[PDB]
Design a protein around this ligand. Structure first.
Ligand SMILES: [Mg+2]
Ligand SMILES: [Mg+2]
Ligand SMILES: [Mg+2]
Ligand SMILES: [Mg+2]
Ligand SMILES: [Mg+2]
Ligand SMILES: [Mg+2]
Ligand SMILES: [Mg+2]
Ligand SMILES: [Mg+2]
Ligand SMILES: [Mg+2]
Ligand SMILES: [Mg+2]
Ligand SMILES: [Mg+2]
Ligand SMILES: [Mg+2]
Ligand SMILES: [Mg+2]
Ligand SMILES: [Mg+2]
Ligand SMILES: [Mg+2]
Ligand SMILES: [Mg+2]
Ligand SMILES: [Mg+2]
Ligand SMILES: [Mg+2]
Ligand SMILES: [Mg+2]
Ligand SMILES: [Mg+2]
Ligand SMILES: [Mg+2]
Ligand SMILES: [Mg+2]
Ligand SMILES: [Mg+2]
Ligand SMILES: [Mg+2]
Ligand SMILES: [Mg+2]
Ligand SMILES: [Mg+2]
Ligand SMILES: [Mg+2]
Ligand SMILES: [Mg+2]
Ligand SMILES: [Mg+2]
Ligand SMILES: [Mg+2]
Ligand SMILES: [Mg+2]
Ligand SMILES: [Mg+2]
Ligand SMILES: [Mg+2]
Ligand SMILES: [Mg+2]
Ligand SMILES: [Mg+2]
Ligand SMILES: [Mg+2]
Ligand SMILES: [Mg+2]
Ligand SMILES: [Mg+2]
Ligand SMILES: [Mg+2]
Ligand SMILES: [Mg+2]
Ligand SMILES: [Mg+2]
Ligand SMILES: [Mg+2]
Ligand SMILES: [Mg+2]
Ligand SMILES: [Mg+2]
Ligand SMILES: [Mg+2]
Ligand SMILES: [Mg+2]
Ligand SMILES: [Mg+2]
Ligand SMILES: [Mg+2]
Ligand SMILES: [Mg+2]
Ligand SMILES: [Mg+2]
Ligand SMILES: [Mg+2]
Ligand SMILES: [Mg+2]
Ligand SMILES: [Mg+2]
Ligand SMILES: [Mg+2]
Ligand SMILES: [Mg+2]
Ligand SMILES: [Mg+2]
Ligand SMILES: [Mg+2]
Ligand SMILES: [Mg+2]
Ligand SMILES: [Mg+2]
Ligand SMILES: [Mg+2]
Ligand SMILES: [Mg+2]
Ligand SMILES: [Mg+2]
Ligand SMILES: [Mg+2]
Ligand SMILES: [Mg+2]
Ligand SMILES: [Mg+2]
Ligand SMILES: [Mg+2]
Ligand SMILES: [Mg+2]
Ligand SMILES: [Mg+2]
Ligand SMILES: [Mg+2]
Ligand SMILES: [Mg+2]
Ligand SMILES: [Mg+2]
Ligand SMILES: [Mg+2]
Ligand SMILES: [Mg+2]
Ligand SMILES: [Mg+2]
Ligand SMILES: [Mg+2]
Ligand SMILES: [Mg+2]
Ligand SMILES: [Mg+2]
Ligand SMILES: [Mg+2]
Ligand SMILES: [Mg+2]
Ligand SMILES: [Mg+2]
Ligand SMILES: [Mg+2]
Ligand SMILES: [Mg+2]
Ligand SMILES: [Mg+2]
Ligand SMILES: [Mg+2]
Ligand SMILES: [Mg+2]
Ligand SMILES: [Mg+2]
Ligand SMILES: [Mg+2]
Ligand SMILES: [Mg+2]
Ligand SMILES: [Mg+2]
Ligand SMILES: [Mg+2]
Ligand SMILES: [Mg+2]
Ligand SMILES: [Mg+2]
Ligand SMILES: [Mg+2]
Ligand SMILES: [Mg+2]
Ligand SMILES: [Mg+2]
Ligand SMILES: [Mg+2]
Ligand SMILES: [Mg+2]
Ligand SMILES: [Mg+2]
Ligand SMILES: [Mg+2]
Ligand SMILES: [Mg+2]
Ligand SMILES: [Mg+2]
Ligand SMILES: [Mg+2]
Ligand SMILES: [Mg+2]
Ligand SMILES: [Mg+2]
Ligand SMILES: [Mg+2]
Ligand SMILES: [Mg+2]
Ligand SMILES: [Mg+2]
Ligand SMILES: [Mg+2]
Ligand SMILES: [Mg+2]
Ligand SMILES: [Mg+2]
Ligand SMILES: [Mg+2]
Ligand SMILES: [Mg+2]
Ligand SMILES: [Mg+2]
Ligand SMILES: [Mg+2]
Ligand SMILES: [Mg+2]
Ligand SMILES: [Mg+2]
Ligand SMILES: [Mg+2]
Ligand SMILES: [Mg+2]
Ligand SMILES: [Mg+2]
Ligand SMILES: [Mg+2]
Ligand SMILES: [Mg+2]
Ligand SMILES: [Mg+2]
Ligand SMILES: [Mg+2]
Ligand SMILES: [Mg+2]
Ligand SMILES: [Mg+2]
Ligand SMILES: [Mg+2]
Ligand SMILES: [Mg+2]
Ligand SMILES: [Mg+2]
Ligand SMILES: [Mg+2]
Ligand SMILES: [Mg+2]
Ligand SMILES: [Mg+2]
Ligand SMILES: [Mg+2]
Ligand SMILES: [Mg+2]
Ligand SMILES: [Mg+2]
Ligand SMILES: [Mg+2]
Ligand SMILES: [Mg+2]
Ligand SMILES: [Mg+2]
Ligand SMILES: [Mg+2]
Ligand SMILES: [Mg+2]
Ligand SMILES: [Mg+2]
Ligand SMILES: [Mg+2]
Ligand SMILES: [Mg+2]
Ligand SMILES: [Mg+2]
Ligand SMILES: [Mg+2]
Ligand SMILES: [Mg+2]
Ligand SMILES: [Mg+2]
Ligand SMILES: [Mg+2]
Ligand SMILES: [Mg+2]
Ligand SMILES: [Mg+2]
Ligand SMILES: [Mg+2]
Ligand SMILES: [Mg+2]
Ligand SMILES: [Mg+2]
Ligand SMILES: [Mg+2]
Ligand SMILES: [Mg+2]
Ligand SMILES: [Mg+2]
Ligand SMILES: [Mg+2]
Ligand SMILES: [Mg+2]
Ligand SMILES: [Mg+2]
Ligand SMILES: [Mg+2]
Ligand SMILES: [Mg+2]
Ligand SMILES: [Mg+2]
Ligand SMILES: [Mg+2]
Ligand SMILES: [Mg+2]
Ligand SMILES: [Mg+2]
Ligand SMILES: [Mg+2]
Ligand SMILES: [Mg+2]
Ligand SMILES: [Mg+2]
Ligand SMILES: [Mg+2]
Ligand SMILES: [Mg+2]
Ligand SMILES: [Mg+2]
Ligand SMILES: [Mg+2]
Ligand SMILES: [Mg+2]
Ligand SMILES: [Zn+2]
Lengths: 97, 64, 84, 150, 53
RNA sequence: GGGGGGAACCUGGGGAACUGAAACAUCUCAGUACCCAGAGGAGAGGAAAGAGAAAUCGACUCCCUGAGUAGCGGCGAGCG
RNA sequence: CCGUGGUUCGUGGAGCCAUGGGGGAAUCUGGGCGGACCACCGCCUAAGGCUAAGUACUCCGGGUGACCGAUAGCGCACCA
RNA sequence: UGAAAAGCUAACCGAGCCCGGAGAUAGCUGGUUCUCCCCGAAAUGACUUUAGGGUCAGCCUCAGGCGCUGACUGGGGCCU
RNA sequence: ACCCGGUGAAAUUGAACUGGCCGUGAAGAUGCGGCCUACCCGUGGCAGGACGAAAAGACCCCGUGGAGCUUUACUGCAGC
RNA sequence: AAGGGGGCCUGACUGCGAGGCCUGCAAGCCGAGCAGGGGCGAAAGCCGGGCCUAGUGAACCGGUGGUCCCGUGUGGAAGG
């Protein structure tokens, strides 16, 4: 999953640390790492279709910012937009951001 | 580059005023139920390392 | 070719050497506390100014000079004459 | 004295040793390294101050002792440096820590504790702390011990 | 030792410190061990009793 | 207005293993080599939701020192 | 809060800075921080951005070597 | 890729070639260059994932200190 | 193949003034001992020796070497 | 008497330890005597487990009971 169009969120490298044994916290000897390796964590990207200026616009955003998509529609209601291509519109909405 | 202190030695040993090297007596960490009082007591003290091993350890603590 | 059905050895061990024996002799000068005899049982018996430890070790109780003695059937003794 | 007249004292400048330059020199062939083995190789031995051929080392078999500290590190306490009366002879009148430091005695950033070694002159010594014996010894020779709290 | 010859502490009844450690056979002498022993804390003697090691 | 190039230097995205640990997996090598994007004669950083114990300092960067200290660490090798 | 990175910090009493996931405020009587947590006493003002110098480098120009002198010195003194 | 031989993949493939990490590592083998003078070993013990490698001791050497203490021999006790 | 005219390599090579026997010696001697034998130099031939050439033995063992393969070896990752 | 029986008992002590055996280190071993508070004995005295020599495991990591020494601005607490 690439980049969230609203928040700019994107996947990062994160480790998978594998441990073993009882925690010292619980009077154990202590945790022992049996392995470290890299994985990725993706943004919860989701698809949010939406209709601006009667034309249907489709965003791809993290779930986290979905309500911000709907904020943008609310704000672009005060705007000349008609006869613009769907891309033309989306580019304009993101300009409000 | 400049030398590093051996933290293992630094945590186990001391350099006296005259450069003697002292440590705790070994052999008291556990299994003591049947160790005599005398033995647990005498191991409670410090002892001066033999010269050869002593002088090896002093090299390890150079900024001491 | 060569290395045929040989064998093994059901024994083949021993204990560490224990360094027993007389450690100071007749006429030797000694400090109180000096070990005089390491032994098993009383191969020697403690005499004048000589004590015996739990493992039969004979040591001097005074500074002095070590002296031996065979009293026949009464055994052998290590003494320590003190010095004036 | 001429430039030619200049030379070091005998002993002040030795010729460096140069191994591996032939039979007569005395360090040839092997170059004082003897025959074969780890120690003869370039690179050579593991740090001989520690390593013992893989047996548990004498150092590592001794037991650790006392507070070893822990993150977030050490705790800043007031540091005290001692000075004895014996090293207070080179003074007259007041004796402030400010003097004692400006004298090579009192190490900077240390508070001043007077210790009791040597004999006392009747003076006003101002310190952060006093030895039991020093306090009274100074009082006996009549001097004026003042305790700072700053 | 063993499951049967076990290890144990002797606790001073006066001040609850454990000052000695020894053993016993559990099968042979199954009762707690009562014994007078010097207490360094109390600086006298004291009846000490067995306490699980 | 951009594109493409530039010896090294610079920031960012990704990122090894040999090796050391006298074996080895945590650890080390090392955020190194290398790949990619970008910046420019530099680049980065920069006007405190800072430091941290003094009723103190006052953006950042660079050098010396503090210091192989405080600490980190199969509390080992080592790191710092 | 969960999964991680950064720091001397390897899960450690583990804060602080960063954030992939979930829950989700307040506008100064508000918030963050001073190594779990709580009280006290203090420091700071997050979730917008810019900024010279001091620093790094050497394709290039110059100057200088108890630097080399054609098997040396750059791979190349020469039509490399 | 293989109608299967670990075959083939630019004239040697149980893991292509090039450049790079890179002077990987090598407790192994080999090599280590002028002269004269004085001394002069060891191939033993202990521990060692140690056994053709190491750490401590033993034996060599150099400097400073001590100064008859040395090997060997005579007399005399004691030990076996 | 051999001879004459023309052109003209190679592996190898410490240096060679390079005989036999019986002994000897690191146990398989042109090279040491004692005897025996042998005028100097070549050409065409044969392969018993020079432990002949070639390839730092592939067998064997050693190295706390490497690699490919296996699994109910350990630890991990993909995948589900 | 170190063997067999009985009486009373817990020295199968706490704080130390002159001096030695052994020995590469680290370990291991014997120990008179001093103080505390005890046991048995009329007493001298003996008692710091067992006639003696095997019956064992360094350090690291953690547990449990004490203590109240450190504890990150201060008092607690976490942790040592
Ligand atoms: Mg995308
Ligand atoms: Mg990332
Ligand atoms: Mg990352
Ligand atoms: Mg850990
Ligand atoms: Mg949707
Ligand atoms: Mg339409
Ligand atoms: Mg649409
Ligand atoms: Mg939502
Ligand atoms: Mg939410
Ligand atoms: Mg518009
Ligand atoms: Mg160094
Ligand atoms: Mg260290
Ligand atoms: Mg350590
Ligand atoms: Mg010493
Ligand atoms: Mg005990
Ligand atoms: Mg004690
Ligand atoms: Mg010495
Ligand atoms: Mg040093
Ligand atoms: Mg055969
Ligand atoms: Mg057979
Ligand atoms: Mg049989
Ligand atoms: Mg024997
Ligand atoms: Mg032995
Ligand atoms: Mg033997
Ligand atoms: Mg006795
Ligand atoms: Mg004995
Ligand atoms: Mg006699
Ligand atoms: Mg007689
Ligand atoms: Mg008799
Ligand atoms: Mg008799
Ligand atoms: Mg008899
Ligand atoms: Mg008799
Ligand atoms: Mg002159
Ligand atoms: Mg001159
Ligand atoms: Mg010189
Ligand atoms: Mg020489
Ligand atoms: Mg020589
Ligand atoms: Mg040579
Ligand atoms: Mg040498
Ligand atoms: Mg050689
Ligand atoms: Mg060599
Ligand atoms: Mg080497
Ligand atoms: Mg070396
Ligand atoms: Mg080295
Ligand atoms: Mg050792
Ligand atoms: Mg060591
Ligand atoms: Mg410390
Ligand atoms: Mg710290
Ligand atoms: Mg009572
Ligand atoms: Mg029971
Ligand atoms: Mg009582
Ligand atoms: Mg541009
Ligand atoms: Mg470009
Ligand atoms: Mg970035
Ligand atoms: Mg980078
Ligand atoms: Mg990028
Ligand atoms: Mg690695
Ligand atoms: Mg190394
Ligand atoms: Mg290694
Ligand atoms: Mg190695
Ligand atoms: Mg390395
Ligand atoms: Mg990075
Ligand atoms: Mg770094
Ligand atoms: Mg770099
Ligand atoms: Mg300029
Ligand atoms: Mg600049
Ligand atoms: Mg500039
Ligand atoms: Mg700049
Ligand atoms: Mg900026
Ligand atoms: Mg900025
Ligand atoms: Mg300000
Ligand atoms: Mg602080
Ligand atoms: Mg101040
Ligand atoms: Mg203050
Ligand atoms: Mg001030
Ligand atoms: Mg103030
Ligand atoms: Mg490290
Ligand atoms: Mg570190
Ligand atoms: Mg590092
Ligand atoms: Mg680290
Ligand atoms: Mg977190
Ligand atoms: Mg990060
Ligand atoms: Mg980290
Ligand atoms: Mg860093
Ligand atoms: Mg962390
Ligand atoms: Mg920790
Ligand atoms: Mg942390
Ligand atoms: Mg907090
Ligand atoms: Mg974060
Ligand atoms: Mg988040
Ligand atoms: Mg609020
Ligand atoms: Mg409001
Ligand atoms: Mg406020
Ligand atoms: Mg702060
Ligand atoms: Mg705090
Ligand atoms: Mg809080
Ligand atoms: Mg602040
Ligand atoms: Mg701002
Ligand atoms: Mg700038
Ligand atoms: Mg130039
Ligand atoms: Mg120039
Ligand atoms: Mg020249
Ligand atoms: Mg030339
Ligand atoms: Mg020439
Ligand atoms: Mg030429
Ligand atoms: Mg040439
Ligand atoms: Mg050039
Ligand atoms: Mg030219
Ligand atoms: Mg040219
Ligand atoms: Mg060129
Ligand atoms: Mg050219
Ligand atoms: Mg085919
Ligand atoms: Mg070809
Ligand atoms: Mg090719
Ligand atoms: Mg082949
Ligand atoms: Mg294949
Ligand atoms: Mg042994
Ligand atoms: Mg081996
Ligand atoms: Mg060996
Ligand atoms: Mg070897
Ligand atoms: Mg040595
Ligand atoms: Mg010898
Ligand atoms: Mg001398
Ligand atoms: Mg003299
Ligand atoms: Mg003489
Ligand atoms: Mg004699
Ligand atoms: Mg013919
Ligand atoms: Mg013809
Ligand atoms: Mg011809
Ligand atoms: Mg010749
Ligand atoms: Mg033959
Ligand atoms: Mg011949
Ligand atoms: Mg030959
Ligand atoms: Mg001859
Ligand atoms: Mg011959
Ligand atoms: Mg002919
Ligand atoms: Mg011919
Ligand atoms: Mg012929
Ligand atoms: Mg032939
Ligand atoms: Mg070969
Ligand atoms: Mg074969
Ligand atoms: Mg190897
Ligand atoms: Mg191995
Ligand atoms: Mg090995
Ligand atoms: Mg193999
Ligand atoms: Mg009896
Ligand atoms: Mg009877
Ligand atoms: Mg009977
Ligand atoms: Mg009986
Ligand atoms: Mg009975
Ligand atoms: Mg009885
Ligand atoms: Mg009675
Ligand atoms: Mg006991
Ligand atoms: Mg004495
Ligand atoms: Mg004394
Ligand atoms: Mg010893
Ligand atoms: Mg033993
Ligand atoms: Mg009594
Ligand atoms: Mg009686
Ligand atoms: Mg009585
Ligand atoms: Mg007893
Ligand atoms: Mg018995
Ligand atoms: Mg027994
Ligand atoms: Mg054992
Ligand atoms: Mg360890
Ligand atoms: Mg513990
Ligand atoms: Mg601990
Ligand atoms: Mg406290
Ligand atoms: Mg505190
Ligand atoms: Mg606090
Ligand atoms: Mg506290
Ligand atoms: Mg505690
Ligand atoms: Zn008590």
């Amino acid at each position: 999953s690439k980049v969230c169009e609203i928040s700019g969120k994107r996947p990062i490298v994160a480790n998978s640390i594998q441990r073993r044994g009882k925690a010292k916290r619980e009077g154990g000897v202590g945790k022992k790492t049996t392995g470290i390796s890299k994985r990725r964590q993706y943004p919860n990207l989701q698809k949010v279709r939406v209709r601006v200026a009667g034309q249907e616009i489709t965003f791809r955003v993290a779930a986290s910012h979905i309500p911000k998509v709907y904020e943008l529609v609310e704000r672009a209601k005060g705007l000349r937009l008609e006869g613009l291509s769907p891309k033309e519109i989306k580019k304009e909405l993101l300009k409000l951001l | 580059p400049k030398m590093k202190t051996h933290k293992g030695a630094k945590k186990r040993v001391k350099i006296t005023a005259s450069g003697k090297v002292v440590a705790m007596k070994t052999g008291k960490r556990h299994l003591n139920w049947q160790k005599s009082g005398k033995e647990i007591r005498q191991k409670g003290r410090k002892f001066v390392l033999a010269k050869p091993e002593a002088e090896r350890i002093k090299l390890l603590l150079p900024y001491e | 070719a060569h290395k045929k059905g040989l064998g093994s050895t059901r024994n083949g061990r021993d204990s560490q050497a224990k360094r027993l024996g007389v450690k100071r002799y007749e006429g030797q000068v000694v400090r109180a506390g000096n070990i005089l005899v390491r032994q098993r049982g009383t191969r020697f018996k403690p005499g004048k100014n000589v004590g015996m430890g739990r493992d039969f070790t004979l040591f001097a109780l005074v500074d002095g000079v070590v002296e031996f003695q065979d009293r026949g059937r009464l055994g052998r003794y290590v003494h320590v004459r003190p010095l004036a | 004295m001429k430039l030619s007249d200049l030379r070091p004292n005998p002993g002040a400048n030795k010729r460096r040793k140069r191994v591996g330059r032939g039979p007569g020199s005395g360090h040839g062939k092997t170059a004082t390294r003897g025959h074969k083995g780890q120690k003869s190789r370039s690179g050579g031995l593991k740090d001989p101050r520690r390593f013992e051929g893989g047996r548990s080392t004498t150092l590592m078999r001794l037991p650790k002792r006392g507070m070893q500290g822990q993150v977030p590190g050490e705790i800043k306490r007031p540091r005290y440096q001692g000075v004895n009366l014996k090293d207070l002879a080179r003074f007259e009148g007041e004796v402030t820590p400010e003097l004692l430091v400006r004298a090579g005695l009192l190490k900077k950033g240390y508070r001043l504790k007077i210790l009791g070694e040597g004999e006392a002159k009747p003076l006003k010594v101002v310190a952060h702390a006093f030895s039991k014996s020093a306090l009274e010894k100074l009082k006996a020779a009549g001097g004026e011990p003042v305790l700072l709290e700053a | 030792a063993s499951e049967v010859r076990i290890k144990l502490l002797l606790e001073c009844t006066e001040c609850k410190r454990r000052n000695y450690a020894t053993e016993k056979n559990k099968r042979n002498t199954p009762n707690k061990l009562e014994l007078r022993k010097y207490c360094p804390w109390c600086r006298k003697h004291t009846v000490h009793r067995e306490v699980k090691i």
